[PDB]
Design an enzyme around this catalytic site. Structure first.
Site, PDB file in Angstrom:
ATOM      1  N   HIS A   1       7.676-108.301 -32.182  1.00  0.00           N
ATOM      2  CA  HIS A   1       8.191-109.228 -33.180  1.00  0.00           C
ATOM      3  C   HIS A   1       7.738-108.885 -34.595  1.00  0.00           C
ATOM      4  O   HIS A   1       8.218-109.514 -35.542  1.00  0.00           O
ATOM      5  CB  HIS A   1       7.853-110.681 -32.806  1.00  0.00           C
ATOM      6  CG  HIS A   1       6.501-111.167 -33.212  1.00  0.00           C
ATOM      7  ND1 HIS A   1       5.433-111.255 -32.337  1.00  0.00           N
ATOM      8  CD2 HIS A   1       6.052-111.638 -34.401  1.00  0.00           C
ATOM      9  CE1 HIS A   1       4.385-111.743 -32.977  1.00  0.00           C
ATOM     10  NE2 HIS A   1       4.736-111.988 -34.230  1.00  0.00           N
TER      11      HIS A   1
ATOM     12  N   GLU B   1      -9.102-100.161 -43.568  1.00  0.00           N
ATOM     13  CA  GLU B   1      -9.076-101.277 -44.507  1.00  0.00           C
ATOM     14  C   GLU B   1     -10.159-102.304 -44.211  1.00  0.00           C
ATOM     15  O   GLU B   1     -10.445-102.614 -43.053  1.00  0.00           O
ATOM     16  CB  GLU B   1      -7.720-101.979 -44.454  1.00  0.00           C
ATOM     17  CG  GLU B   1      -6.588-101.231 -45.091  1.00  0.00           C
ATOM     18  CD  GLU B   1      -6.601-101.326 -46.610  1.00  0.00           C
ATOM     19  OE1 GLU B   1      -7.694-101.557 -47.180  1.00  0.00           O
ATOM     20  OE2 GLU B   1      -5.527-101.166 -47.227  1.00  0.00           O
TER      21      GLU B   1
ATOM     22  N   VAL C   1      -7.898-104.239 -52.474  1.00  0.00           N
ATOM     23  CA  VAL C   1      -8.774-103.396 -53.271  1.00  0.00           C
ATOM     24  C   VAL C   1      -8.922-102.059 -52.568  1.00  0.00           C
ATOM     25  O   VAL C   1      -9.124-102.011 -51.353  1.00  0.00           O
ATOM     26  CB  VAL C   1     -10.155-104.064 -53.456  1.00  0.00           C
ATOM     27  CG1 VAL C   1     -11.112-103.156 -54.228  1.00  0.00           C
ATOM     28  CG2 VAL C   1      -9.998-105.399 -54.157  1.00  0.00           C
TER      29      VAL C   1
ATOM     30  N   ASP D   1       6.365-108.445 -25.632  1.00  0.00           N
ATOM     31  CA  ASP D   1       6.154-108.391 -27.081  1.00  0.00           C
ATOM     32  C   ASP D   1       5.188-107.254 -27.416  1.00  0.00           C
ATOM     33  O   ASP D   1       4.003-107.456 -27.696  1.00  0.00           O
ATOM     34  CB  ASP D   1       5.633-109.736 -27.578  1.00  0.00           C
ATOM     35  CG  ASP D   1       5.616-109.836 -29.095  1.00  0.00           C
ATOM     36  OD1 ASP D   1       6.258-108.992 -29.751  1.00  0.00           O
ATOM     37  OD2 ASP D   1       4.966-110.757 -29.617  1.00  0.00           O
TER      38      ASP D   1
ATOM     39  N   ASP E   1      -8.901-119.886 -33.295  1.00  0.00           N
ATOM     40  CA  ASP E   1      -7.661-119.297 -32.805  1.00  0.00           C
ATOM     41  C   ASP E   1      -7.265-118.168 -33.751  1.00  0.00           C
ATOM     42  O   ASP E   1      -7.762-118.079 -34.875  1.00  0.00           O
ATOM     43  CB  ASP E   1      -6.567-120.379 -32.730  1.00  0.00           C
ATOM     44  CG  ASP E   1      -5.350-119.986 -31.896  1.00  0.00           C
ATOM     45  OD1 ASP E   1      -5.334-118.936 -31.226  1.00  0.00           O
ATOM     46  OD2 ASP E   1      -4.381-120.780 -31.912  1.00  0.00           O
ATOM     47  N   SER E   2      -6.351-117.319 -33.292  1.00  0.00           N
ATOM     48  CA  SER E   2      -5.608-116.471 -34.206  1.00  0.00           C
ATOM     49  C   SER E   2      -4.472-117.287 -34.826  1.00  0.00           C
ATOM     50  O   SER E   2      -4.267-118.458 -34.492  1.00  0.00           O
ATOM     51  CB  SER E   2      -5.116-115.219 -33.488  1.00  0.00           C
ATOM     52  OG  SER E   2      -4.300-115.522 -32.374  1.00  0.00           O
TER      53      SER E   2
ATOM     54  N   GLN F   1      -0.802-117.053 -37.895  1.00  0.00           N
ATOM     55  CA  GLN F   1       0.216-116.280 -38.591  1.00  0.00           C
ATOM     56  C   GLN F   1      -0.432-115.188 -39.433  1.00  0.00           C
ATOM     57  O   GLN F   1      -1.405-115.434 -40.146  1.00  0.00           O
ATOM     58  CB  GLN F   1       1.043-117.216 -39.477  1.00  0.00           C
ATOM     59  N   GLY F   2       0.114-113.976 -39.342  1.00  0.00           N
ATOM     60  CA  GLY F   2      -0.416-112.833 -40.048  1.00  0.00           C
ATOM     61  C   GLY F   2      -1.403-112.021 -39.244  1.00  0.00           C
ATOM     62  O   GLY F   2      -1.698-110.880 -39.610  1.00  0.00           O
TER      63      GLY F   2
ATOM     64  N   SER G   1      -0.576-111.528 -36.056  1.00  0.00           N
ATOM     65  CA  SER G   1       0.359-110.973 -35.079  1.00  0.00           C
ATOM     66  C   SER G   1       0.292-109.452 -35.023  1.00  0.00           C
ATOM     67  O   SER G   1       0.200-108.772 -36.050  1.00  0.00           O
ATOM     68  CB  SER G   1       1.790-111.396 -35.416  1.00  0.00           C
ATOM     69  OG  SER G   1       1.952-112.807 -35.407  1.00  0.00           O
ATOM     70  N   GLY G   2       0.369-108.921 -33.804  1.00  0.00           N
ATOM     71  CA  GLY G   2       0.314-107.505 -33.580  1.00  0.00           C
ATOM     72  C   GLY G   2      -1.077-106.949 -33.426  1.00  0.00           C
ATOM     73  O   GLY G   2      -1.228-105.839 -32.905  1.00  0.00           O
TER      74      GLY G   2
HETATM   75 CA   LIG Z   1      -8.641-101.660 -49.226  1.00  0.00          CA
END
Ligand SMILES: [Ca+2]
Length: 223
Positions: A40, A52, A57, A84, A171-172, A174-175, A177-178
Protein backbone atom coordinates in the site's frame (compact mmCIF):
# COMPACT_ATOMS: atom_id res chain seq x y z
CA UNK A 1 5.14 5.66 16.55
CA UNK A 2 2.91 6.56 19.49
CA UNK A 3 4.28 6.08 22.98
CA UNK A 4 7.79 5.14 21.88
CA UNK A 5 11.32 6.42 22.44
CA UNK A 6 13.97 8.12 20.34
CA UNK A 7 15.99 5.25 18.85
CA UNK A 8 19.28 7.11 18.54
CA UNK A 9 21.08 7.89 15.30
CA UNK A 10 21.75 4.84 13.11
CA UNK A 11 20.87 2.31 15.83
CA UNK A 12 18.34 0.68 13.45
CA UNK A 13 20.65 0.36 10.45
CA UNK A 14 18.23 -1.57 8.20
CA UNK A 15 15.53 1.14 8.42
CA UNK A 16 14.91 3.06 5.20
CA UNK A 17 12.81 6.07 4.32
CA UNK A 18 10.92 6.04 1.01
CA UNK A 19 10.95 9.56 -0.40
CA UNK A 20 8.90 11.02 -3.27
CA UNK A 21 9.76 14.63 -2.48
CA UNK A 22 8.92 13.95 1.17
CA UNK A 23 8.94 10.94 3.49
CA UNK A 24 5.85 8.80 2.92
CA UNK A 25 6.67 5.24 4.09
CA UNK A 26 9.25 3.08 5.77
CA UNK A 27 10.98 -0.04 4.53
CA UNK A 28 13.73 -2.51 5.40
CA UNK A 29 17.01 -3.24 3.62
CA UNK A 30 17.30 -7.02 3.11
CA UNK A 31 20.51 -6.97 1.05
CA UNK A 32 22.72 -4.48 -0.74
CA UNK A 33 20.23 -3.95 -3.59
CA UNK A 34 16.71 -4.80 -2.33
CA UNK A 35 14.23 -3.20 0.07
CA UNK A 36 10.98 -4.66 1.36
CA UNK A 37 7.99 -2.46 2.20
CA UNK A 38 4.19 -2.52 2.18
CA UNK A 39 2.31 -2.81 -1.10
CA UNK A 40 0.00 0.00 0.00
CA UNK A 41 3.10 2.25 -0.10
CA UNK A 42 3.41 1.67 -3.85
CA UNK A 43 4.00 4.67 -6.06
CA UNK A 44 6.18 5.66 -9.00
CA UNK A 45 9.31 7.77 -8.61
CA UNK A 46 10.63 6.39 -5.31
CA UNK A 47 14.00 7.41 -3.91
CA UNK A 48 15.22 5.15 -1.12
CA UNK A 49 17.04 6.97 1.70
CA UNK A 50 19.42 4.89 3.81
CA UNK A 51 21.41 5.85 6.87
CA UNK A 52 18.83 8.41 8.01
CA UNK A 53 18.14 9.72 11.47
CA UNK A 54 16.87 13.28 11.01
CA UNK A 55 15.07 13.13 7.65
CA UNK A 56 15.19 16.95 7.32
CA UNK A 57 18.93 17.43 7.95
CA UNK A 58 21.94 16.02 6.11
CA UNK A 59 23.98 14.51 8.94
CA UNK A 60 26.64 12.65 6.94
CA UNK A 61 25.77 8.93 6.87
CA UNK A 62 22.95 9.05 4.29
CA UNK A 63 22.83 7.20 1.01
CA UNK A 64 20.17 8.25 -1.51
CA UNK A 65 19.49 5.68 -4.23
CA UNK A 66 16.67 5.71 -6.77
CA UNK A 67 14.50 2.64 -7.33
CA UNK A 68 14.86 0.84 -10.65
CA UNK A 69 11.96 -1.60 -10.27
CA UNK A 70 9.09 -2.14 -7.84
CA UNK A 71 7.23 -5.45 -7.48
CA UNK A 72 3.92 -5.57 -5.64
CA UNK A 73 2.92 -9.02 -4.43
CA UNK A 74 0.88 -10.81 -7.15
CA UNK A 75 -2.09 -11.33 -4.78
CA UNK A 76 -2.14 -7.95 -3.02
CA UNK A 77 -5.74 -6.90 -2.27
CA UNK A 78 -6.02 -3.17 -1.57
CA UNK A 79 -9.49 -3.50 -0.01
CA UNK A 80 -8.57 -6.09 2.66
CA UNK A 81 -4.79 -5.40 2.73
CA UNK A 82 -4.14 -9.12 2.38
CA UNK A 83 -0.59 -9.73 1.06
CA UNK A 84 0.51 -6.18 1.89
CA UNK A 85 4.13 -6.55 0.79
CA UNK A 86 6.28 -5.25 -2.05
CA UNK A 87 9.90 -5.41 -3.14
CA UNK A 88 11.96 -2.46 -4.42
CA UNK A 89 15.21 -2.90 -6.35
CA UNK A 90 17.81 -0.17 -6.05
CA UNK A 91 19.50 1.21 -9.16
CA UNK A 92 22.88 0.59 -7.54
CA UNK A 93 24.02 -1.43 -4.55
CA UNK A 94 24.20 0.30 -1.19
CA UNK A 95 27.53 0.54 0.63
CA UNK A 96 27.11 -1.59 3.73
CA UNK A 97 28.76 -0.54 6.99
CA UNK A 98 27.93 -0.42 10.71
CA UNK A 99 25.26 2.26 10.18
CA UNK A 100 23.72 0.88 6.96
CA UNK A 101 23.10 -2.84 7.19
CA UNK A 102 20.68 -5.48 6.00
CA UNK A 103 18.25 -7.38 8.23
CA UNK A 104 18.01 -11.16 7.92
CA UNK A 105 14.87 -12.85 6.68
CA UNK A 106 13.28 -15.37 9.06
CA UNK A 107 13.65 -19.12 8.79
CA UNK A 108 10.67 -19.69 11.08
CA UNK A 109 7.62 -17.73 12.11
CA UNK A 110 7.65 -15.98 15.46
CA UNK A 111 5.24 -17.04 18.20
CA UNK A 112 2.89 -14.93 20.28
CA UNK A 113 4.66 -13.40 23.25
CA UNK A 114 7.90 -12.71 21.38
CA UNK A 115 9.16 -9.16 21.94
CA UNK A 116 9.88 -7.15 18.79
CA UNK A 117 11.24 -3.73 17.78
CA UNK A 118 9.08 -1.47 15.59
CA UNK A 119 10.46 1.77 14.18
CA UNK A 120 9.51 4.69 11.98
CA UNK A 121 8.99 8.39 11.36
CA UNK A 122 5.20 8.31 11.58
CA UNK A 123 2.72 10.25 13.67
CA UNK A 124 3.42 10.28 17.41
CA UNK A 125 -0.09 11.26 18.61
CA UNK A 126 -3.26 9.19 18.95
CA UNK A 127 -5.36 12.35 18.58
CA UNK A 128 -4.04 15.11 16.39
CA UNK A 129 -0.86 15.15 14.37
CA UNK A 130 2.81 15.58 15.19
CA UNK A 131 5.43 14.12 12.90
CA UNK A 132 8.93 13.66 14.28
CA UNK A 133 12.05 14.32 12.30
CA UNK A 134 14.16 11.67 14.07
CA UNK A 135 13.53 7.95 14.14
CA UNK A 136 11.26 6.59 16.87
CA UNK A 137 11.28 3.09 18.35
CA UNK A 138 8.82 0.85 20.18
CA UNK A 139 9.23 -2.53 21.84
CA UNK A 140 6.04 -4.57 21.60
CA UNK A 141 5.01 -8.23 21.84
CA UNK A 142 3.31 -10.35 19.23
CA UNK A 143 -0.26 -11.03 20.32
CA UNK A 144 -2.07 -14.36 20.13
CA UNK A 145 -4.04 -14.97 16.96
CA UNK A 146 -7.14 -15.43 19.13
CA UNK A 147 -6.76 -11.95 20.65
CA UNK A 148 -6.02 -10.48 17.21
CA UNK A 149 -9.10 -12.04 15.62
CA UNK A 150 -11.23 -10.96 18.60
CA UNK A 151 -10.13 -7.32 18.15
CA UNK A 152 -10.79 -7.30 14.39
CA UNK A 153 -13.60 -9.78 13.64
CA UNK A 154 -13.63 -10.96 10.05
CA UNK A 155 -10.53 -8.98 9.03
CA UNK A 156 -7.46 -11.03 10.03
CA UNK A 157 -6.03 -13.46 7.48
CA UNK A 158 -3.28 -16.05 7.90
CA UNK A 159 -0.91 -13.45 6.38
CA UNK A 160 -1.35 -11.01 9.27
CA UNK A 161 -0.48 -10.80 12.94
CA UNK A 162 -1.21 -8.30 15.70
CA UNK A 163 1.43 -6.73 17.91
CA UNK A 164 1.22 -4.13 20.63
CA UNK A 165 -0.92 -3.46 23.68
CA UNK A 166 -4.65 -4.02 24.11
CA UNK A 167 -4.70 -1.30 26.79
CA UNK A 168 -3.66 1.19 24.10
CA UNK A 169 -1.21 4.06 24.32
CA UNK A 170 1.62 2.40 22.37
CA UNK A 171 1.41 1.58 18.66
CA UNK A 172 2.71 2.31 15.21
CA UNK A 173 0.77 4.87 13.17
CA UNK A 174 0.39 6.71 9.87
CA UNK A 175 3.77 7.25 8.22
CA UNK A 176 5.26 4.15 9.84
CA UNK A 177 3.67 2.00 7.11
CA UNK A 178 6.06 -0.31 5.32
CA UNK A 179 8.61 -0.26 8.12
CA UNK A 180 10.12 -3.14 10.06
CA UNK A 181 9.04 -5.37 12.91
CA UNK A 182 12.23 -7.11 14.03
CA UNK A 183 12.20 -9.99 16.52
CA UNK A 184 15.34 -11.81 17.67
CA UNK A 185 17.35 -10.24 14.85
CA UNK A 186 14.98 -11.28 12.06
CA UNK A 187 12.43 -9.33 10.03
CA UNK A 188 9.07 -10.81 11.04
CA UNK A 189 6.60 -8.03 10.18
CA UNK A 190 5.80 -5.01 8.03
CA UNK A 191 3.75 -2.12 9.41
CA UNK A 192 0.44 -2.50 7.56
CA UNK A 193 -2.77 -1.21 9.19
CA UNK A 194 -4.89 -0.62 12.27
CA UNK A 195 -7.97 1.27 13.44
CA UNK A 196 -6.68 4.67 14.46
CA UNK A 197 -3.48 4.57 16.48
CA UNK A 198 -2.86 3.40 20.04
CA UNK A 199 -6.58 2.94 20.76
CA UNK A 200 -7.79 0.49 23.38
CA UNK A 201 -8.52 -3.00 22.01
CA UNK A 202 -7.23 -2.03 18.53
CA UNK A 203 -3.60 -3.18 18.22
CA UNK A 204 -1.47 -2.74 15.15
CA UNK A 205 -1.72 -5.29 12.35
CA UNK A 206 1.40 -6.42 10.51
CA UNK A 207 2.18 -8.39 7.38
CA UNK A 208 3.49 -11.85 8.35
CA UNK A 209 6.85 -11.93 6.55
CA UNK A 210 7.65 -15.58 7.25
CA UNK A 211 4.86 -16.56 4.80
CA UNK A 212 6.66 -14.73 1.96
CA UNK A 213 10.28 -15.87 2.24
CA UNK A 214 10.08 -18.20 -0.77
CA UNK A 215 8.49 -15.51 -2.97
CA UNK A 216 11.10 -12.96 -1.85
CA UNK A 217 14.04 -15.28 -2.54
CA UNK A 218 12.69 -16.43 -5.92
CA UNK A 219 11.93 -12.86 -6.98
CA UNK A 220 15.36 -11.50 -6.01
CA UNK A 221 17.08 -14.40 -7.80
CA UNK A 222 15.45 -13.57 -11.15
CA UNK A 223 15.25 -9.75 -11.17
CA1 LIG B 1 19.31 13.09 7.32
Amino acid sequence: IVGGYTCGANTVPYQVSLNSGYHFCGGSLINSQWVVSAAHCYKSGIQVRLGEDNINVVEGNEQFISASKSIVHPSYNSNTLNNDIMLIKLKSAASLNSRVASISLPTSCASAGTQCLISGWGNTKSSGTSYPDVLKCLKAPILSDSSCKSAYPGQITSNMFCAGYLEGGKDSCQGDSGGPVVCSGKLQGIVSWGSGCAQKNKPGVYTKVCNYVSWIKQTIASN
